[PDB]
Design a binder for this molecule. Structure first.
Ligand SMILES: CCCN(CCC)C(=O)c1cc(C(=O)N[C@@H](Cc2ccccc2)[C@H](O)CNC(C)(C)c2cccc(OC)c2)cc(N2CCCCS2(=O)=O)c1
Ligand SMILES: CCCN(CCC)C(=O)c1cc(C(=O)N[C@@H](Cc2ccccc2)[C@H](O)CNC(C)(C)c2cccc(OC)c2)cc(N2CCCCS2(=O)=O)c1
Ligand SMILES: CCCN(CCC)C(=O)c1cc(C(=O)N[C@@H](Cc2ccccc2)[C@H](O)CNC(C)(C)c2cccc(OC)c2)cc(N2CCCCS2(=O)=O)c1
Ligand SMILES: CCCN(CCC)C(=O)c1cc(C(=O)N[C@@H](Cc2ccccc2)[C@H](O)CNC(C)(C)c2cccc(OC)c2)cc(N2CCCCS2(=O)=O)c1
Lengths: 323, 329, 323, 329
């Protein structure tokens, strides 16, 4: 299959490379199941941040198709803006002409953008999540008969153990062990499924759970989070929504998430980030109209995940500890 | 059959507020009345922040109908975040009252300087249930479910600075507040008060746009490409680094928005979307229009539209009615 | 003597009232020995922040003298700008015509300004510290023969025990006990004196020590601070220059400051701010070209202080625990 | 008697840099050479930040002349903060070298986005000892104390975009770099390179102003009242909310600064203080002038002044010499 290497950056985040243009101009991406647009910064971007990145030049590519529709993308960390373009996009060994955003202004995305090592973002969500009604890249590959199955998988890197892969088009056995259970999407928007959630006696039945590679935390309803952390020797840190603890804290809880078909757990080792024997919890309280858990990178580090557009499902199995 | 009229007070021809009460001792608060959200909150007497010191505060200990809940909750708005916990008590809007679940806010430090600088105490959402944190049935729906009104509908007649005052009306439609036809547009989703309209600014067209009627926003938002095209050669200027557009207040070349359905036509002339900014420049105006892109191309028809048009929000028929607001009450 | 009451605000800060104009328009001030200008917001200020404050109107005062020179004041927390004016300023029972800054713009001082309960700042430093070469108010009172001694004293409030006072013109016995030792200023700029500083075996000889009522911390050279906190069970909090600990931490150190004439100590109880049994340290690391300690509110809470312009000195004694 | 000339490279006719080395293996770095500060720092190989990944880094383990110190220190600049610790090693500036104390920087996250977006690795201060953190004797003073040069002085001949390159010179004055008289102004304090001059812009006068010559600032700063008066009726506009002033690049009504002492006269015409901002507007310029008030009324004579005037910084005679820079080297 088409494997894109996922490269750990100092155990903080992971990135993958892909190319744009028939001259294959190289970019580093966040590979984000929580979004659904592809963007790269343009040679026509002149902001401070752009001068530090790899840039796209439409003039150097023969397969460029103009669109020019203005567009702005909004993220938690800020906004980028520019215009739609179309060109050849190569992800590992596969390429296809594809619509994307050429970014001209990054000043509303700072300091994040200058302070990070990615050039752009490559969304892997569903069509209805995208600005511009862009068919997802994996769907388009399948439509243009370049892969048989419109699915992709994540096997995340683990610092100083092993690298990761985004695989497009088939499921490799080498990445997981135990049973692979598929959970049906509750909406074709995010990769969002319905699970019962428990920590000890704290529970939330039929929680909406979003599998988001673009987020390095588990997000939890604020009342659930408040209940789960009391009497634990975790310290809320003032002026910020973060929590610290002793790395060796034996009181720390395990999330359990269950469907009729599978049971998934996330122990403290997957959500603790070492920072003097002290660790931050990669868990954040967030309320939405549908009580939701965002199962970000800490969950995906434990569990290999399969994202299947043909079956409208997320497949979850234990990731193999080594490759 | 008995309309409940809540008077609306203008603020700097920009925003409007209305008052309602919480508790069986009718503790008074000034609210943003917001069709763009679906929670009610008030600041608590347990809120110690500097901002809360300037506000009317809710004291549950003074109300015999208070029912503790205590579920923690944090509300996220564009202007910031407030957090607290759920409570239940009598909520009074004009002459109608009911036991209702709301958020008692204890921290407002993530909502400054907005909150201290504003004259409201809280927000009262008037959207649909699926927009609410905590799955709270909207007040007007709950009033109808409790048999306190016949029709689950409300209307907005917005105040106009120096001209007339405004009303929120629950339970029926006052003919005195509109002229010309009243046309109803079916909701495309029961979430925002969101309808489907074709949008045109002369030359530039966007068919089947999603249009959200949002009383809690003082602007019109438009897709960024549509905005860029509409301003092309207009004697308007983008202030550098900022999302804002300025022009002489006397500019005679500004466009009219036109929105159409199969049943109706609605226009918004420059006079409804210009904001005087004399502080910045003699004869200068800000275009109160912001570009914003969503997965479905969307216009947010905020206060500027609602100051022109009387609006009817009908939960039983899942629709929005639109009619020219009476220029003199 | 002229006593201005110092009113505790939720054990976070203290403020005092004074008036401007012959109609005595009332303001709440930060009373700041670390600065040397008086400003108030003007009725001509139209920014968001000003609408929430008490404002000055020159038109309503018969003793107003125009100046109109533009000026901007810069603080750590941001900037305010406006223009010089002259009018009657009343501090307790004394008034005098005095030059001050009318503030027209507060947008560079936000969110601090809107989020606080003061209207303006009343500086109590030396002439060379002031923008505009303004003679300090206490010096001017003495020059215009309204007090005999150009000195003032601080006795700070203690939450839920007792209120505070700024006294102008004489030293009240009721405020202190033990010996009052005067330390000569090393420069007529800040109220800055030379002390040897020790924590355990960590020392800095002839440190510059600035007595600053406008600051709620002790600031310490960064290397001294790093040495003093190691092996203490204090947790540096990520992304911010703050430290937390258990309120009952018995390992916490005591600052000692010595001159040839006096010895001053500051125990953990004076620098711990309660915030779940957890306390923040009111201590911040800061390096200057002259190795400096800023003895802010935590020091002034323990020690009554006398600021004497005639003798160029700071007098320090134990503050009485109750009034 | 042997001048040490370090070549200076221009950046966007805005800033300039020069290279020097640290370690007895001459590890190379690009520096801001800053008469407005008095510390040398370089980023360490132990710096793991994203910004440091783009820079030349200092590896003490590769230098035989490295001497550990390890005193922690944090430097505060207007653009932010860097922190690390003191170290001592061979520092090489052109052909002169000496063992010298400097800061090895381990964290630059409080100095972003400035630092990653810039092409420098570190800063090399050229002010007086009392301006330094840690009481470090300035490099040029230390060179003279070690008998490596005869005169503790240095000069700046700034590069000019598309015209000529620049030099920092240590130890003597090159006649080729200036024309017209060279006039020396006595320092008013041994801290910045600060001199006393009368300032005039036609009508507007400020006597005995403190003038700081500051190579590390790309602007001229002026007292805010003086700035407000000088711009009065000029066809210049303040961009709203911002501290910035714009004008047509062709404006023929812009003023000349004049500074005078009893011995000399120095002027700065519009062409030295305008910055083209074509990105914002065709034919548009930014006035590279900022208002700033200090306890003594002060002008900071940054790069724009130094691009016009050759400057001599003399530690032995406590003075600054000023002469028109040669327009063609
Ligand atoms: C060590 C790396 C840290 N980065 C922070 C970078 C600013 C993150 O892990 C991160 C990335 C994102 C993010 O927007 N991710 C989107 C992808 C992305 C990544 C970097 C820059 C821009 C955008 C992703 O598309 C968001 N997915 C959805 C929409 C599901 C999401 C996630 C979390 C909260 C949401 O609503 C507020 C929405 C969000 C977070 N947050 C959750 C935990 C702390 C609060 S937060 O900032 O809202 C964190
Ligand atoms: C009310 C009068 C003054 N305020 C300024 C507030 C700082 C506004 O006009 C205002 C209120 C809101 C708001 O969130 N409104 C929500 C209600 C509200 C009002 C005041 C304070 C907090 C909250 C309202 O519920 C938002 N409705 C939805 C969710 C439909 C909305 C509107 C606009 C943009 C959205 O998403 C990007 C979402 C948003 C704006 N903006 C429009 C103009 C610039 C972009 S913006 O910041 O997003 C403006
Ligand atoms: C709970 C109240 C917290 N407030 C923060 C309000 C922003 C303070 O205690 C405070 C007030 C000031 C301040 O500027 N004080 C000046 C007076 C003032 C007070 C409020 C608003 C504006 C101005 C005072 O004039 C500063 N004195 C000097 C110049 C000696 C000073 C003190 C500390 C650090 C300095 O250099 C960076 C300089 C400075 C601090 N800081 C020291 C500890 C944390 C870092 S800091 O922000 O630089 C803290
Ligand atoms: C070098 C080319 C680009 N940089 C932009 C940096 C973000 C500048 O032109 C620059 C560098 C500095 C700076 O701190 N310069 C110090 C050296 C430096 C240079 C780059 C990065 C960090 C540090 C220099 O040592 C400052 N000298 C003194 C202390 C005399 C100074 C200058 C100006 C204002 C001061 O106090 C308010 C103090 C200051 C400025 N400003 C002038 C224009 C707007 C106001 S400002 O922000 O204060 C500009």
């Amino acid at each position: 299959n088409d494997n894109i290497e996922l490269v750990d950056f100092q155990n903080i985040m992971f990135y993958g490379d892909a190319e744009v243009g028939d001259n294959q101009q190289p970019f580093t991406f966040i590979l984000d199941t929580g979004s659904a647009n592809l963007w790269v910064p343009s040679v026509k971007c002149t902001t401070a941040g752009c001068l530090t990145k790899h840039l796209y030049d439409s003039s150097k590519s023969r397969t460029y198709e103009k669109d020019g529709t203005k567009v702005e993308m909004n993220y938690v960390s800020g906004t980028v803006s520019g215009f739609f373009s179309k060109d050849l996009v190569t992800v590992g060994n596969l390429s296809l002409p594809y619509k994307f955003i050429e970014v001209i202004d990054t000043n509303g995305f700072e300091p994040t953008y200058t302070a990070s090592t990615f050039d752009g973002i490559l969304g892997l969500g569903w069509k209805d999540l995208s600005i511009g009604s862009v068919d997802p890249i994996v769907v388009e590959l399948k439509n243009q008969n370049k892969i048989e199955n419109a699915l992709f998988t994540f096997y995340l890197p683990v610092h100083d153990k092993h690298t990761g892969f985004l695989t497009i088009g088939g499921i490799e056995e080498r990445f997981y062990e135990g049973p692979l259970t598929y959970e049906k999407l509750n909406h074709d928007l995010y990769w969002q499924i319905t699970l019962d959630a428990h920590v000890g006696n704290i529970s939330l039945e039929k929680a909406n759970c979003i599998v988001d590679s673009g987020t390095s935390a588990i997000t939890v309803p604020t009342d659930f989070l408040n209940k789960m952390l009391q009497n634990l020797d975790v310290i809320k840190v003032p002026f910020l929504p973060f929590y610290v603890t002793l790395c060796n804290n034996s009181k720390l809880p395990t999330f359990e998430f269950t469907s009729e078909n599978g049971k998934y757990t996330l122990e403290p080792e997957y959500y603790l980030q070492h920072i003097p024997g002290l660790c931050m919890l990669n868990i954040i309280g967030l309320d939405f109209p549908v009580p939701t858990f965002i199962l970000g990178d800490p969950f995906m580090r434990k569990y290999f995940t399969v994202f299947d557009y043909d079956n409208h499902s997320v497949g979850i199995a234990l990731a193999k500890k080594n490759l």
